[PDB]
Ligand binder design. Structure first.
Ligand SMILES: OC[C@H]1O[C@H](OC[C@H]2O[C@H](O)[C@@H](O)[C@@H](O)[C@@H]2O)[C@@H](O)[C@@H](O)[C@@H]1O
Ligand SMILES: OC[C@H]1O[C@H](O)[C@@H](O)[C@@H](O)[C@@H]1O
Length: 362
């Protein structure tokens, strides 16, 4: 009885009415810039799966302005090339989805510039591969910057000209990620790697298991499947997704609701508030690829049922509505960080995570 398309549009309206800045062509200048890129990916994804184009003009506005050289990183020379490789990766993947929606080669070209920019900080001399996240310091090869890069080259291997060098880079990047040790004994991905002070060897730093570090890798393995037709990539993604859905690992509550590790202590900062929706959208990409790769009608049913359970829970316990006025006739929905907990406030990262879950059910 739940229309995920209608609720996604209501959440996007709530996101715009409360957090969109027309004068800046950006959501919430007080919140991390990379989350505007995630929010743009959510809006673009809503339009792709629903067939709507209500926000196409707004998206183009954001793209044209945020494409300019960043005031805090002019050496990047615009095209979303920022001071952290993970910032560039989020916008690069948004530009891939923009190309998927419009077919405009201009957006694909941004994604190609972003790939070359990110590879500038891939080094085989530390950890045998992988790239750094802190461009200025080069002290952290974490999980998210390398999952974003892996998903980028894997997508370019399916859409860009000269896609062979991108397929070669994606297969080598996955080989490094697998052998890095960041995937642990229960098939979940820790935050990043640390380096031995004496030997220079790298090891899993045992930092928290974040939901979006279990999601972006699924989209990367799905794009690696499309380019190779090798179901081995899907099986590896399925093992990671299964670990997230298993209540023994703590990411799935006893009610079957996705729960970030910081929700219990109510310590989720601006970054962590958006992590859940990123995983949900990527899990929908896996479930779609799994269902199409087999003739079983029940293929991917566990992932679809999981997304539906979380949608209903957040529908009933995490929802609020903006108060309409005599002057502002705007309508929509607002959401907090916990998909099962109550509503205390609504911020842009929590709103963006909200849209991602609804779009994952479209
Ligand atoms: O919150 C957990 C993550 O925290 C850091 O990533 C977020 C921050 O780092 C990015 O380089 C920049 O975009 C910042 O603006 C952003 O706030 C990393 O430690 C990451 O590995 C963690 O998962
Ligand atoms: O304002 C500074 C600007 O650059 C920083 O590196 C990032 O945190 C951005 O999110 C922020 O908007």
């Amino acid at each position: 009885s739940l229309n995920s398309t209608g609720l996604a549009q209501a959440a996007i309206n709530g996101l715009n009415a409360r957090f969109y800045e027309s004068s800046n062509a950006r959501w919430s200048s007080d919140e991390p810039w990379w989350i505007s890129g995630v929010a743009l990916t959510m809006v673009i994804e809503y339009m792709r799966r629903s067939g709507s184009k209500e926000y196409l003009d707004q998206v183009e506005d954001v793209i044209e302005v945020q494409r300019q050289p960043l005031s805090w990183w002019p050496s990047g020379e615009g095209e979303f090339r920022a001071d952290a490789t993970n910032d560039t990766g989020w916008w690069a993947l948004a530009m891939v989805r923009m190309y998927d929606l419009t077919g405009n080669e201009d957006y694909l070209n941004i994604s190609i510039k972003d790939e070359a920019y990110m590879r500038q900080w891939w080094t085989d001399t530390e950890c045998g591969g992988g790239l750094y996240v802190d461009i200025q310091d080069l002290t952290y090869k974490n999980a998210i910057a390398n999952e974003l890069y892996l998903k980028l080259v894997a997508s370019l291997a399916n859409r860009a000209p000269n896609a062979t060098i991108y397929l070669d880079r994606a297969q080598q990047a996955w080989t490094w990620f697998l052998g890095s040790g960041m995937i642990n004994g229960v098939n979940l991905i820790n935050d990043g790697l640390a380096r031995d002070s004496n030997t220079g060897s790298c090891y899993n730093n045992r930092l928290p298991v974040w939901t979006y570090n279990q999601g972006v890798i699924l989209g990367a393995l799905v794009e690696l499947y499309h380019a190779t037709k090798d179901e081995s990539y899907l099986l590896s993604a399925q093992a990671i997704a299964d670990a997230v859905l298993s209540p023994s690992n703590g990411l799935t509550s006893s009610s079957g609701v996705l729960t970030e590790t910081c929700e219990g202590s109510d310590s989720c900062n601006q970054d962590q508030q958006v992590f859940k929706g990123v995983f949900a959208l990527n899990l929908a990409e896996l479930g779609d690829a799994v269902a199409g790769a087999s003739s079983d009608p029940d293929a991917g049913q566990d992932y679809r049922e999981y997304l539906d359970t979380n949608m209903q829970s957040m529908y009933a316990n995490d929802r609020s509505e903006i108060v309409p006025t005599l002057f502002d006739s705007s309508t929509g929905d607002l959401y907090d960080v916990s998909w099962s907990g109550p509503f205390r406030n609504a911020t842009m990262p929590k709103q963006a995570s909200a849209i991602g879950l609804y779009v994952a059910n479209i």
